[PDB]
Structure 1
Amino acid sequence: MYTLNWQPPYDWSWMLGFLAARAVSSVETVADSYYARSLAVGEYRGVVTAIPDIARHTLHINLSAGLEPVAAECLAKMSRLFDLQCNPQIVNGALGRLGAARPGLRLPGCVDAFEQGVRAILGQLVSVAMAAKLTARVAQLYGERLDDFPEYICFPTPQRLAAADPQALKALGMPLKRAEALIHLANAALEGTLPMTIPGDVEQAMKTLQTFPGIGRWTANYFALRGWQAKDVFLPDDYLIKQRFPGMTPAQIRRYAERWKPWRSYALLHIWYTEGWQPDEA
Structure 2
Amino acid sequence: LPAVLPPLTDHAGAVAHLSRDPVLAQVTSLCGELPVLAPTPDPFGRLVRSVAGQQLSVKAAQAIYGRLEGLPGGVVPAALLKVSGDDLRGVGLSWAKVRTVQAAAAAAVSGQIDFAHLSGQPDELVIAELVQLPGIGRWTAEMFLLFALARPDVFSSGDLALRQGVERLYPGEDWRDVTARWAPYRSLASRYLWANSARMQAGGAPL
Same fold, TM-score > 0.5, yes or no: yes
Higher RCO (CA-CA < 8 Å; seq separation 6+): 2
Q: Report how many aligned residue pairs link the two structures.
A: 184
Change (3 A) 1:178 1:93: same
Show the counterpart of 2:185.
263
Q: Choose which of 128, 139, 149 in structure 1 pairs with 2:69.
A: 139
* CA drift at 1:135: 0.9
Report 1:48-197 matches (<5 A): 86-96=9-19, 97=25, 98-100=27-29, 101-103=31-33, 105-143=35-73, 155-196=74-115, 197=118
Q: TM-score, normalised by structure 1?
A: 0.55
* CA drift at 1:103: 3.5
Structure richer in strand, relative to its length: 1
Show the counterpart of 1:49.
none
Sequence identity of aligned pairs in percent? 26
User: C-alpha distance in 2, partners of 1:142/1:240?
Assistant: 38
User: C-alpha distance in 2, partners of 1:247/1:94?
Assistant: 21
* CA drift at 1:208: 2.5
Note the residue ranges of structure 2 that are not aligned, 5 or more in a row.
Answer: 1-5, 20-24
Show the counterpart of 2:130.
209
Note the residue ranges of structure 1 that are not aligned, 5 or more in a row.
Answer: 1-79, 144-154
Cα contact 1:163–1:183 (8 A) shared by 2: no
Show the counterpart of 2:22.
none
Structure richer in helix, relative to its length: 2
Q: CA RMSD in A?
A: 3.2
Cα contact 1:232–1:265 (8 A) shared by 2: yes
SS across alignment from 1:141: coil
| Residues 114-154 of structure 1: per-residue CA shift (max 9 Å, x gap) | 111111212322333322222112112344xxxxxxxxxxx
Change (3 A) 1:108 1:254: farther
User: C-alpha distance in 2, partners of 1:239/1:166?
Assistant: 32
User: C-alpha distance in 2, partners of 1:122/1:221?
Assistant: 16
